[PDB]
From Swiss-Prot:
Organism domain of life: Eukaryota
GO terms for cellular component: azurophil granule lumen; extracellular exosome; extracellular region; extracellular space; specific granule lumen; tertiary granule lumen
Top-level taxonomy: Eukaryota, Metazoa, Chordata, Craniata, Vertebrata
E.C. designation(s): 3.2.1.17
Organism, as annotated: Homo sapiens
Protein known as: Lysozyme C
Family, as annotated: Belongs to the glycosyl hydrolase 22 family.
Length: 130
């Protein structure tokens, strides 16, 4: 599923993402936008280390979800990577919360540093009623 901007904003708020570990909803929106374009079935294979990023938040198979084909992988979140390609984002959200429970926080995603960090991100949630 490809979420419409505000539709996603409201859904993330309802799921308790606003201010989770100090991360504003605007920031979670900026991350989803650059990671997958708000697309739940987005997948990206990293030929360099043989891992794959899954879902709306592009969660990595080496540490957060299990896909069986990733060399020396762990399952911090403890989910099947399959769960992160569903239209319902409850599991993707729980996985994203687990990632930021590590000291790096939102910085775990390279894309966030490049396109969100130290920027005016209000535009991602403006007019959505959140």
């Amino acid at each position: 599923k490809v979420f419409e901007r505000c539709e996603l904003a409201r859904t993330l708020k309802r799921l308790g993402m606003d201010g989770y570990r100090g991360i504003s909803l605007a920031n979670w929106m900026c991350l989803a936008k650059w990671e997958s374009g708000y697309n739940t079935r987005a997948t990206n294979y990293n030929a360099g280390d043989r891992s794959t990023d899954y879902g709306i938040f592009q969660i990595n198979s080496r540490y957060w979800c299990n896909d069986g084909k990733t060399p020396g992988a762990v399952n911090a979140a403890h989910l099947s990577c399959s769960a992160l390609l569903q239209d319902n984002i409850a599991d993707a959200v729980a996985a994203a919360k687990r990632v930021v429970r590590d000291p790096q926080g939102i910085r775990a995603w390279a894309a966030w540093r490049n396109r969100c960090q130290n920027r005016d991100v209000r535009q991602y949630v403006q007019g959505c009623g959140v």
